[PDB]
Amino acid sequence: CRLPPLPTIREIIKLLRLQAAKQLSQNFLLDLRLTDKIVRKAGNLTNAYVYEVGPGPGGITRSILNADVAELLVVEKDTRFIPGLQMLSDAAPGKLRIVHGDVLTFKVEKAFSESLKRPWEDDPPNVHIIGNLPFSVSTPLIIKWLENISCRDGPFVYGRTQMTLTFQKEVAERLAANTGSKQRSRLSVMAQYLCNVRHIFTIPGQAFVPKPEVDVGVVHFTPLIQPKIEQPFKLVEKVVQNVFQFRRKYCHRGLRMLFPEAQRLESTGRLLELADIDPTLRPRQLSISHFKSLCDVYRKMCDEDPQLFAYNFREELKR
RNA sequence: GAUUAACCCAAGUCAAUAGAAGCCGGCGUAAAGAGUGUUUUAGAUCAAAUAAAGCUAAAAAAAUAGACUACGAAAGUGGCUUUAACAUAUCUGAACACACAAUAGCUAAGACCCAAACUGGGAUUAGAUACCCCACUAUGCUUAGCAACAGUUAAAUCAACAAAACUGCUCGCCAGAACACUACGAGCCACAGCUUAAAACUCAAAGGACCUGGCGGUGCUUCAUAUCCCUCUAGAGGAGCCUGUUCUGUAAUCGAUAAACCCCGAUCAACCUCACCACCUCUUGCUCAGCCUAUAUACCGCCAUCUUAACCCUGAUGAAGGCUACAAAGUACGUUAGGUCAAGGUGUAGCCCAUGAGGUGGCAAGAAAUGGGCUACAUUUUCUACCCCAGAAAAUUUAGCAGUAAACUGAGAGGCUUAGUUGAACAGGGCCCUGAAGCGCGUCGUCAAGUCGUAAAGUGUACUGGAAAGUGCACUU
Ligand SMILES: [Mg+2]
Ligand SMILES: [Mg+2]
Ligand SMILES: [Mg+2]
Ligand SMILES: [Mg+2]
Ligand SMILES: [Mg+2]
Ligand SMILES: [Mg+2]
Ligand SMILES: [Mg+2]
Ligand SMILES: [Mg+2]
Ligand SMILES: [Mg+2]
Ligand SMILES: [Mg+2]
C-alpha cells in the first residue's frame, strides 16, 4: 500500500501560511516511527473500526492505515489539512472517511453501523478510538467520555470501546496514579472507577518538531465491566472534588464543605461514621472503596434531604 | 594455533592463593570546616540594641534626615516621650548543658478588610486569551503544639580557576565510582497499592581546572559597486519570393549541378544529367576494369573545447601565544566517439552478375503557426543643370559610451580587407558580483545502527479537570 510521503515542517509552514517556524502555536509528531509504536500499543487493529481524533498532518493517520483497518473515521477541525487527508483517502480507497467538526460535539454514536454493537459484559466491540489532540482539548474530552461510560451512551453505545489518547506526562501519570502516590488526584479516581487505565510510555518533548518544554504520555482506557461505584456521575464528581479540594489536609476538612454551615459539624460526623472512613486519612490515601462508601452514604443523605445536592459553599460565603 | 628463532631463570620453572610492603597527607571548586552566644574536665602561650507603658503627624505602619553605617551574639533595629537597660581584664574547647534564632511540613482552635493557587460563571479565534472580567476557597494573619585565635609580608608568591600568599596553636572532619543500586523484609493497608534500606556485587575508572578549535556553516550592515541593470536616445512588423520546424500524404527526394540552363541580373521547374520509386537488360566487361562508397570514430594539417622553511622572544621553559607609527617583540603540455576531404596531403578498408554500365515509366507534394534571409517601400522624395540662391515631376531586437549611430563616395584580393565626405539624439536612479571593512548568529531527532527521516528572563515549592504547560507564594540578575 503506497501512500504519499509525510509533509515536512517546511511544507507545513507553507500550508499554514505562517512563513516562519516560531509561530505555529502547535506541536506536530512528524515521526512515522513513534506513531507506528503508538498504533502498535493501541492493540490489534486488523479489520477494526478506528475513530481517530485530532488527525493533523496525518502521521497517526498513516500509521493506522498501515494497519489493516476496515473503516477509519477522521474528524479534523482545520480545513488546511483536509487537502492532505483527501490525498490520503484517495491513496487508500474506501478506508478513510473524513469529517469536519469539533470532537467535543461530534456524535460518534451514529457514525458506525449498528452491527458492531456488542453487549457491555462481552469483549470490547472491535471499535477503537485513537487520539493525539491538543492537551487543551483532551482533558474536557476525557471527562465527557467518562460521563458517557457512566451513562453507557455516546461512543460506548457499541459497548466497551477502547481508547488510546495522548496527554501531558504529568496528566497521564495522574490519570494512571495508584493510592498514596504523589500524583493521586481527582482525575485518577474519576478515570479509575470506570476504566482500566494504563500509562504505557512517555515521548520526550524533543521528539516533536516544534519541541515543547514538556513530555507526552500515551494512556490506554478500557471501560470496566463492573464500575467500582454504582452512583450517578455528577454525584461521584462532587464527592471527589470536595475530598480533593484540600489535598494536604485530612479528608474531613474537605468533606465538611458538602453540607451547610448550620449542620456542618454533625452532618460531617454522621457521614464519616455511617461510612467507616478514618478521619486521619489524607485524600491521596483513599481507595475507590472509601469513595464508594462515601458516595453511598451521601446519596442517602441527599435522598432524605432534597436541598443538599445543589449546595455550593462558596455561594453561601458570598453573603 | 603450529613452526623457526630469540629472551629470562634453571633442576627447576611459575599459574593460583596468602603475606611482606602505606597515613606527620588534606578539608573554596576534586572525599573532607560557617546559625549565634555563654559555660564546660582539659590544652595553648596569644595572659536606628532590648522590654514596658503612654502619645502621635501626614496617608494600622513610620515619607525628609539617611550622601548616615551606629546598636545588637545572630536573626534583626531607623515616629516622639518617660522608665528599666546594653555580660565579661588571655585564647581554643558541646552531638551530649542553658539560652536564643531561622527554615520546611502537618495538627488544634480563632479573625477575615484585602489579595489569592484551586473551583464555578461571563467574553472572546475558527483547537478563541494559558493571558481579560466577576465570585469565592486553601493560603497570606493570630496564638498553642509537634573553621576559631595570635603574629608575618619575608621569601621561590604562584598545577590551574577563584579570593595575594604565610606561619604558629587548637578543635571537628576526610581516606575510589558509591550521599551508587537494590525491599530479603518492616509499618500502613487489607489483594494490590504507598512509605521505608544498608551491604555485598561489578568496574578501571570516577572526579576537578584549562586550551585548541572546527562548523567545507548561517545571515545582515555599510559603502568603491565598474560589466550587468532599469531609465533615456535612434532605427528595425505590411507585400512578394527563398529557407528552418511541425502535421498530413505518396511506391517515391517540392533532393543536388568542380555535372544543366541562361548569355541583363538572378532564377523555377528543366524532356540535361545525377538522386528517389516500380519493372527489366548487360558480364568478363574499359583499359588486370568501374564507384567519390566509408574512415581525419585512420594519422598529419587547420580550427575549436577543457585542465595545468628558518631565526628570535612571551607564558615559572603546559597545551599555547607574538599587535599599537607620538609604535609596546617580532624579523625573514595533455584533452576530445569534437568540426573540417571545397582552395592540403599519407594510408586503410568496402562492392567487383554490382556499391558497375544501361533501358522503360513515374517522381515535380498540400496545409498552417512561428524562426530567419533577399528586393521596393517618396515629398527632409525623384529627374536635369550644378556641386547647395534653379527649373520640372509627383513585440522583441540592433546600436549608444562621438567623429559613434545614420546617410553617401572611392580603392583593392579576387562576402572579405582598406581610404574618405556629411554628421546627430540621450547622457539620470540601482544592482549581480569580486573589491573595502563591521556586527551578529550558530555552536536535529527516532524504532529496532542503517538497505532510518530530515533545514524581562530564570530558580525553587504548592495546586492544576479547558495542563504542548498555567497560575499562586517566596527568591536571583
Ligand atoms: Mg613445582
Ligand atoms: Mg567537596
Ligand atoms: Mg570559648
Ligand atoms: Mg477577593
Ligand atoms: Mg572549633
Ligand atoms: Mg524532385
Ligand atoms: Mg556515380
Ligand atoms: Mg572527428
Ligand atoms: Mg489552571
Ligand atoms: Mg511557578
Residues 6+ apart with CB under 8 A from A99: A73, A74, A75, A76, A106
Task: Provide the number of structural domains found in chain A.
Answer: 2
This entry's atomic model was obtained through cryo-EM
CATH number for the domain that contains residue A252: 1.10.8.100
CATH of the domain at A149: 3.40.50.150
Which positions of strand B lie within 7 Å of protein CB atoms? 105-108, 117-119, 126-128, 130, 135-139, 189-190, 192-195, 444-448, 452-455, 462-469
* Contact call for residues A189 and A240 (beta carbons, < 8 A): yes
Q: Are residues A287 and A140 in the same domain?
A: no
Nucleotide closest in space to A10 (CA vs C1'): B455
Domain boundary among A169, A190, A223: A223
Mapped onto helix, strand or coil, the DSSP state of residue A151 is: helix
Ligand 9 midpoint to CA A261 (Å): 28
Residue A3 within any structural domain of the chain: no
Please list the alpha-helical segments (H only) found in chain A. 9-16, 32-41, 59-66, 82-91, 135-151, 169-175, 186-192, 233-244, 251-255, 264-274, 288-303, 313-317
Grid coordinates representing A77 are 477541525
Q: Cell triple for residue A124? A: 470490547
> Resolution of the deposited coordinates, in angstroms?
2.7
Three-state secondary-structure class, residue A125: coil
Contact A200, A41 (CB under 8 A): yes
What is the C-alpha separation between A39 and A35, in angstroms, rounded?
Answer: 6
Vertex A89: Cα angle to A160 and A140 (nearest 5): 40
Centroid of ligand 5 to alpha carbon of A156 (angstroms): 73
* Residues A181, A308 within the same domain: no
The verdict on A70 and A101 lying in the same domain is yes
Ligand 10 geometric centre to CA of A20 (Å): 30
DSSP designation for A245: T
Spatial contact of A214 and A269, defined as CB atoms under 8 Å apart: no
Last-in-domain residue among A195, A223, A251: A223
